[PDB]
């Protein structure tokens with residue numbers, strides 16, 4: 001199951017997705033696998049893993065560079081092998097942006113498929129926030145500046161994705177990475193996350209889904225849109241200003257939970273969210289998708305708050 | 310006593326200082342004092358203080374901006390009034406640099422002299438470090454990235470000063486400010502610090518001097534050079550990687566202290582200084598001033614460590 005989808009047409013409220021198996025792979029990305037030295041495993045699911053590695057001569061012929069390599073475990077079946085190749089083709093289709101985990105190369109010959117991406121040295125944003133949660137005015141002001149910056153950067157990364165007609169479908173702090181300079185990068189662990197052991201992914205129908213992050217139109221109609229990604233961004237803002245607390249606290253995903261969300265029930269503001277960031281969340285959680293803001297508009301709104309400093 | 314001196318000639322190991330009272334003041338800096346609204350006091354000495362204020366229409370005609378205003382207290386005498394004006398003239402002589410507290414304007418008519426500079430919103434680096442001292446691998450790595458950045462930025466600020474033939478004479482973490490984006494800015498509180506109540510300033514001769522930060526040639530010959538500023542930067546590095554501990558721990562400034570420093574005694578490395586930053590400190594503490602590195606060279610050395618990431 002390819003996670004990032006790419007739309008080609010909107011034929012009056014119905015998306016025409018592009019078959020990722022029909023996207024090109026440009027051999028400019030090809031890199032010899034014997035110039036990768038594999039290190040620790042950074043994440044692993046049932047069928048896939050991401051491993052830290054050193055790449056010799058990937059960018060400059062005389063330099064080594066730390067990278068992340070996505071690969072399948074031997075237990076993987078054909079559909080997982082296709083998905084890895086489709087993720088490779090989507091990533092090269094997207095192109096490069098500062099706030100996404102970028103493609104650096106690939107090994108598609110001489111062994112199983114390897115996908116080489118940037119390595120983010122501080123790990124996932126969710127764990128970063130929860131450490132600061134477990135852990136005076138100047139210190140709090142500086143933390144608020146970081147959180148404003150993270151929301152700005154994720155919003156730019158998502159605006160870049162939407163500009164390439166790409167829908168993320170699993171936006172959440174656990175899928176955002178932090179790296180040098182406090183730069184945040186959107187990624188998808190996809191096959192490299194063990195979702196069977198993550199309570200945030202819930203059984204609904206024939207899938208395990210991050211329901212507390214999903215828009216209502218996605219839960220009752222299984223549709224994923226640019227507007228539903230905006231909804232997820234709103235949920236992301238709530239965990240961001242709550243220091244990584246899980247959304248809808250003390251409320252498990254029952255059938256009771258599903259009722260409330262169609263009743264227009266929303267979360268209240270996190271205690272220390274700035275009013276104008278709370279205002280952005282609420283508009284992301286509009287029951288009407290076409291009343292939610294676009295990521296381009298969210299970028300402008302957050303730019304204005306940061307400039308007021 | 311003007312703190313920042315400006316040299317004009319080096320006539321074989323003897324400096325010709327420029328009389329700051331002979332530097333021009335350009336009226337382009339003139340700003341009406343009735344467009345300042347004064348707030349809290351940020352620091353105060355015997356004769357002077359620095360106050361936070363809002364300046365209406367200072368940069369853009371339609372915008373307010375937070376600034377810092379240096380001014381004298383009524384107890385000030387003629388020599389302090391001249392010094393404030395000389396500091397104004399040095400600051401406009403220096404020009405603008407990202408890593409110094411820059412001049413934004415001045416009120417030299419219609420009341421006592423006011424000097425308007427950038428406001429740094431996180432205060433002094435020394436208190437910032439001591440809070441982190443009172444206060445796992447990802448968190449420590451990120452702290453080390455900040456400390457590397459602070460040493461790089463202070464070194465660029467000092468290289469800019471040396472390039473303008475300016476000697477600071479009181480470089481220390483207490484004279485470095487932190488502001489938005491974790492930018493550090495060199496300043497001098499000068500008349501706005503109460504040095505009578507600061508143990509770091511010690512009675513030597515007819516002055517109160519920061520002896521633990523001074524080069525030996527400055528202690529026994531009362532000479533201040535570009536090379537003695539480099540010495541102070543080395544001491545600054547030691548407090549930086551020690552999280553604001555006072556230099557030469559458990560050793561008061563006796564006559565015994567003076568003996569040891571001419572004996573070539575130096576501090577050992579802070580426990581978590583990177584080897585290459587320790588190497589920079591040691592070279593800053595060379596008994597021969599002409600064997601110390603220049604700030605231009607320190608900038609290059611630290612740039613290389615940061616690039617290795």
Ligand SMILES: CCN1CCN(c2cc(Nc3ncc(-c4ccncc4)s3)nc(C)n2)CC1
Nearest residue numbers: 042068117118119120121123187188189446447
């Ligand atoms: C020693 C302390 N730590 C702990 C944790 N720590 C990290 C780093 C990290 N870096 C990644 N870079 C790219 C990734 C990726 C690429 C493509 N698709 C999906 C994911 S994951 N990821 C994790 C989960 N933990 C690093 C150091």
Ligand SMILES: CCN1CCN(c2cc(Nc3ncc(-c4ccncc4)s3)nc(C)n2)CC1
Nearest residue numbers: 137138351377426427428429430432496497498
């Ligand atoms: C509410 C919590 N705090 C605590 C402390 N805090 C600050 C800010 C600050 N900002 C400065 N900007 C320029 C300065 C200057 C200009 C010219 N010459 C010398 C100095 S001092 N300075 C201090 C000492 N504390 C700010 C907020």
